[PDB]
C-alpha cells in the first residue's frame, strides 16, 4: 500500500523477535548485520553489567552462550518512532523468563534500519537489553 508507520514496524518486529527467541534462538542471528551491536544483560565478574558484541557471527556466539531454553515473554509496552535514515527506534518494556525460571522485568532498546535491498525489510542495527533487577 504505502510506507508503513514506525509503530507498525516496531510492533511486528517485537512479535517476530520474541516469537523466534522462544521457538528457535539459534536462528535469531539472522536479524543482524555486520555492524550490529548486541548486549543482553549480564553482570560481569565482580562488577558492573556486561559489555556488548558486534557482527552477526559474534552475536550468534553470544546468543548460543546464553542457552535460551523455552524462553517466555510478556510484553507490557512498546514504543516505536521514526529515527535517522528511515530507521525505527523501539523501546520495549516487559517480563522475560529463561529455562522456566521466574519472570524478570526488563527494558530493551532496538534500532531497526532498512535492509536496503528489499522494500519494507529491516535489520537490527542495535540491541540493548537489560534486566532491571541487575541495575536497581
Amino acid at each position: 500500500m504505502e510506507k508503513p508507520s514506525p509503530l507498525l514496524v516496531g510492533r511486528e518486529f517485537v512479535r517476530q523477535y520474541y516469537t523466534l527467541l522462544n521457538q528457535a534462538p539459534d536462528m535469531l542471528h539472522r536479524f543482524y548485520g555486520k555492524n550490529s551491536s548486541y548486549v543482553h544483560g549480564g553482570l560481569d565478574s565482580n562488577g558492573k553489567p556486561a559489555d556488548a558484541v558486534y557482527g552477526q557471527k559474534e552475536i550468534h556466539r553470544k546468543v548460543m552462550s546464553q542457552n535460551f531454553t523455552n524462553c517466555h515473554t510478556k510484553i507490557r509496552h512498546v514504543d516505536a518512532h521514526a529515527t535517522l535514515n528511515d530507521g525505527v527506534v523501539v523501546q520495549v518494556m516487559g517480563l522475560l523468563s529463561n529455562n522456566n525460571q521466574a519472570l524478570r522485568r526488563f527494558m530493551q532498546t532496538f534500532v531497526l534500519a532498512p535492509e536496503g535491498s528489499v522494500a519494507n525489510k529491516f535489520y537490527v542495527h542495535n540491541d540493548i537489553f537489560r534486566y532491571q533487577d541487575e541495575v536497581f
Binding site: 518486529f13 536479524f31 552477526q56 535492509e115 529491516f122 535489520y123 537490527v124
Partner: peptide, 9 residues
C-alpha cells in the same frame, strides 16, 4: 504492507 526482517545477507 509486508514487513520482514533480516540482515543484508
Amino acid at each position: 504492507p509486508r514487513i520482514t526482517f533480516g540482515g543484508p545477507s
